[PDB]
Every structure is written in C-alpha cells, then in structure tokens.
Amino acid sequence: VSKESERIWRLQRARTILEFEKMLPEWLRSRFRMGELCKVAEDDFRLCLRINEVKWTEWKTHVSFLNEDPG
Amino acid sequence: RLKKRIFAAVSEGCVEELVELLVELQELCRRRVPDFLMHKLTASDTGKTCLMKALLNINPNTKEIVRILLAFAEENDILGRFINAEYTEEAYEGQTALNIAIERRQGDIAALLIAAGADVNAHAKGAFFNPKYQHEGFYFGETPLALAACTNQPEIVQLLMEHEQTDITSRDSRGNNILHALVTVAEDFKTQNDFVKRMYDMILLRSGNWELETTRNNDGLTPLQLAAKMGKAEILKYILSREIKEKRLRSLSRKFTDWAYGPVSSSLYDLTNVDTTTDNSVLEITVYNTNIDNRHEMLTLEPLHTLLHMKWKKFAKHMFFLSFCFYFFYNITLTLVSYYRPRGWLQLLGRMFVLIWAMCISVKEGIAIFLLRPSDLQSILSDAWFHFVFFIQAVLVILSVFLYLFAYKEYLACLVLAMALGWANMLYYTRGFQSMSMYSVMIQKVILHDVLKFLFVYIVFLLGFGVALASLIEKCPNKDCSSYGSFSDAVLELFKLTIGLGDLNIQQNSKYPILFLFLLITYVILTFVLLLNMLIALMGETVENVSKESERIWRLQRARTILEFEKMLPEWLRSRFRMGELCKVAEDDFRLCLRINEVKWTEWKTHVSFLNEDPG
Ligand SMILES: COc1ncnc(OC)c1C(=O)Nc1nc(C(F)(F)F)c(-c2ccnc(C(C)(C)C#N)c2)s1
C-alpha cells in the first residue's frame, strides 16, 4: 500500500507537471525549454538532455565521445 | 596548415602512413631550434600535443602511431620536452600523456611512456581533477599512481611502483597521498566491489613503512582519521583490523592474533590513534561526526566497539546512573513543590535545591547547545535534541522561582510546565538502559512522527467541522439550547466524539438537521478513516524497521554519552582508567594494545600464528 501511495503520488505529480506546462504562455514555455542544443554528428544539432553518471564496474576504454576534453 | 593535418592524421588513426609522410615533411621543414618543432606539434591554445591527441583517440593502430611519434621525438633530441609536455588550460592543468594513457586503460602504451622517460610523479593539478562537486570532475589524487589505483588497474600500479623515480609518499594539492586519495575514492561494496581495499593493501605492503599511514593532509587527518571522518566503513574496517602474517611486514599490522586454539581467538588490537587519548581519534571522530549516517555500522568495529564497552563498564555506567538518580530526585522535589505550592522550614530548602540544580542543568545544557553543531539535529529521534528540552525545563524552573520571588501569579504555569517537561525528559534516561531503550524509542517514534502528522490533519478536521456545525446552529434566547453552540463548544464536542465520550444524538436546535447530521457522520467517518490509516501505518511499517532502529539510536546515544562522560573526568582519572596495555610488537614498537578474546562458534579454519603462544 505504500508502493501504491508513492506510485499514485508520482503519477499525479507528472500529470500536474504537464498540466502546469500547458497553462504557461508560449514565451514562458520557450524560456523554460528543457534541453541544451548539441551537435552529435556531422550536421545534426539535436536538442539533448545531459545526465552525469559514475560507474565503478564496467571498466572500458572510451572510444565513443563527442568531446575529447571533459568538463 | 601542417599542425591540423598531423593532428587529424594522429587522431583518426585510420592512417599512420599519412602521419609518416607528414613527419617526413616536418623533418624537411626542420632541415632549414627545438621550439619551432614543438610549436608545430602542440595546440597553442590548450597545450595538447600529438601524443595527447593520439592517446585520447584510441584505435587498433595507436601503438604503432605512438611508436612513430616517440621515434621522431627521439631522433630530434626533443623527446624530453615532448613526452612530458602538459596542458596549460586551467581545467586540466598538469595533465600529461601518461595520465591520458592510464585513463584510457592502455597498459602497453603506459609502459612505453614510462620506459621513454615520462615523469611518473606528474601532478594533474587542474580544476577538472580537483573539482568542487562530483559528476563534474573526477578527483583521484593528481598522480598517475593514484589514477591507476583509483581506476582499478593493479598492473599499472605495479609497473609504477616498481619504478625507481616514482614517489609513493608524494602529497597532492590537498596534502592527500595515495592512501588519502584511495580513502576519498572508496564508495561501497554494491558500487565498487571492494577493489579500493585491495589497492590499499597492495600499495601499503609494497611500500612497507608507516610513512604513508602517519601522513596528515592539509586538514591534519591521517588516512585512518580520514576514513573515520567520511564514513568509509569498509576501508576503516580493513585498516582498524589489518593482520599481516608475513614475518617482515608484520609491523604494518594493527591486529595481532596471538592465541587462537579452536573457535576461540584472543587478538591484540592497536589503539594508537583510536582510544580517545589524542587530539581527535578514530573513536571521537566516528562518534561525533553527524554528516555521514553510517555511524551505526562504524561503531561496531572490534576496537571501537570494545573500547566503548569497556569505558561504559569502567566509569560511564556509574556516571550515567548517578546522572539519572540526580535528575529523578530533582524531578521528585519539583513535583513536591508543585503540589504543595502556596495557595518555609523545609519547603524552601527543597526549592533552593531545585533552583541551584536548575541553574546547573541550564549552564550545562546551554554550553552543550553553544558547541552543538548543526546536522546533529538532522533526525528527530537523536540525542542532540534533548539538550534543548533539558535547557527549556531548567529555564522554566529558574523563571518560575524568579516569578515567585516577585508578586506574580503566573509562576504556577511555569512550575507545572517544568514538572511535566522533567517527567517527559526522563525519556532520555530510559533510552539509556537497554530494554527501556527499545520501548522508549518506539514510543517516541510513534509520538513525534505519526502522532504529530495525524494531529495536524486532525486539527484541520476539527476546526473545519467545528466551524461547519457551529454556523449551522441558530442563536437562541441562554441555558444550553444547543450543544454545538460557540465554536469552542463545537470543537470540544467533536473531540470527545472522537475519543468515545460523545453522542451523535444531541439537542439539535438547528434549522438544517439532516445537513447537520450528515456533516457529523461525515466527520466521524473521515476521522475513523484517518485514525485507521495512522494505525495501519504504525502496525505495518514499524514492526520491522524501528525494531532495529531502536538499537541504532541506543548505540549512538550510548557512545555520545560515554564520550562526554570521559571528557568530564579530570585528567588523572582518565589516566587511571585508560583501557589498553602496552605490548612489544617488534624490535622497538611498544604500542598500546587492547586484548579482545572472540569466540566464534561457526569456525572452520586453522590458526598457527602467535606473539605469546602460551595461552594467557
Ligand atoms: C478508530 O480506531 C482507531 N484508530 C487509530 N488508533 C486506535 O487505537 C489507539 C483506534 C482504536 O479504536 N483504538 C482502541 N481504543 C480502545 C478503548 F479501550 F479505548 F476502547 C481499544 C481497546 C478496547 C478494549 N480492550 C483493549 C485492550 C486493553 C485489550 C487492548 N489493546 C483496547 S482500542
């Protein structure tokens, strides 16, 4: 029942987030506008969302990346 | 341009012959002294060279590419200033090609660079490698040895440690050496699978000497005190009980099993920077730091656990019982002067007792509050909170005596409040005994968490339905025509409807009686649902969680009480108690060891080692 209450809270939270995003005008929505514009290919330039993670298990040489200088 | 051409030729890696041709052309242009060559081989803005740019972009043909690059550098007497070129940007300042070859987990190329003269003592002192927040930057110790250790590369660590020019005892920007950095980097077992403990053991044995463990960073913290400060419980458990059975590296041990026969084992733990006789030991740090929430797991490690147990048995049990007895008799006298109030032979003697003891309690708990750092008050079921209620009660007592000496009538409110709060504060002492600990923590959890939330929502219900049923009731010319008359009348009737002292059938006197009874039955149903909700939350959630949470809170309060009592004693008394006896460990070691005999009846192994084989 606590799973159920937490799940209901998360679902209604997402629902009211989307409700509130619909009330704003166009300019306020464009001023919030989640997502940074990023070039991912030769000429792609698609809006992305950045997520940092730390994994201490899958040790691999890093050969796929867009920037060679992290930060 | 040739710089961009060579850079792309060395980064793409699909063409090594193209960089060979460009290097032939570079030698041709150089035929026309070293500075022009390295200005055409390193990006002037950042400082990245063809070695860095080649190692950042790894491909199956990068070993031959770096061989070609180092050959061209050696054939020009420039290898020195080329293989040890570093960044210049304030983000990766000091990063070298060895750092880049180790972060890419390139063992062959790393051995190549070290055998070609790369300074293994380079310090990546840039804002990326010394960040302020994780996930933006990565702190490893600012050294290729620390980088190879922090990223689980035991073979590169062996290669760097078997080097002669390497420096294991080198301190980075923060003063952290390899061991402070390994402590800073350790996370958990469900996150790292416990390789930092293995790297710690390896780097400590290979450099067999106390210079790494006795080094203080820019905060004065050794690796052990640093593992205590940030709650690295696995690293701390490893260090605090670390037994080297090798005959030469046994002085690096902290626990010396010298006795084991069957399931029994009498070991000798080390108490050098542990047993509360130094500036800030592992015991005091482990007990007093409230920025981790891992103390429950760290106060169970063998030396700290037995040290707290023995401090208790020796003096703190008695000091706690005397504290409890004094507070109990102070509360009894406060009760007696509250009941027998004036409405001076021995009464004033007792009042002066409670007044001087209230002043003493007030100064004590006020001192404790002054040096009471935040993050202690993070949890409500924490001992730090009690200093506040003890202070408030002592303040109420002295304020009531002040108001009684003068001609005020409100001294009785303060006196009765002080008596009630003292009897409540006895809960601090019942949380110090063991059984009463579980009982009192369960009671206080119920109250402070669930009773207060339920009481907030229930006060909302009470006030709402009291206004609703009071506005529905017609004024009438002044004996009790109604029962839900004034607002306080309605709130009282609803409250004692909840606790079972109320009747649904009263003098109506209202003009909308069906709406009145609908609202009343709605109150009853909603408050039953709320009551049963709280009751279900209690009966389900706390049958398993607070069961152990009781032991957690008891252990924390016990440790904090033991340590403050030990601080209260005079220095000669502390010197008298001072658990732990001297023991010769090596040629000249002579450390204060604590003997702990542990019988584990689930033993399947054999023991052959000793310090005094003759069982004590
Ligand atoms: C709305 O329901 C609730 N919602 C949340 N919490 C609740 O309890 C606090 C309740 C509830 O009804 N509680 C109870 N009240 C009483 C009363 F004695 F007062 F009658 C209970 C009772 C009655 C008779 N014999 C016992 C013994 C001593 C055997 C036990 N045990 C207990 S039980």
Ligand SMILES: COc1ncnc(OC)c1C(=O)Nc1nc(C(F)(F)F)c(-c2ccnc(C(C)(C)C#N)c2)s1
């Ligand atoms: C007297 O017994 C009854 N007879 C007939 N109907 C009843 O229910 C309406 C009842 C009954 O239990 N009433 C109650 N009133 C209250 C009050 F909060 F208001 F004080 C209850 C209470 C008080 C304090 N902590 C709880 C916890 C959080 C432990 C729970 N759960 C519940 S319980």
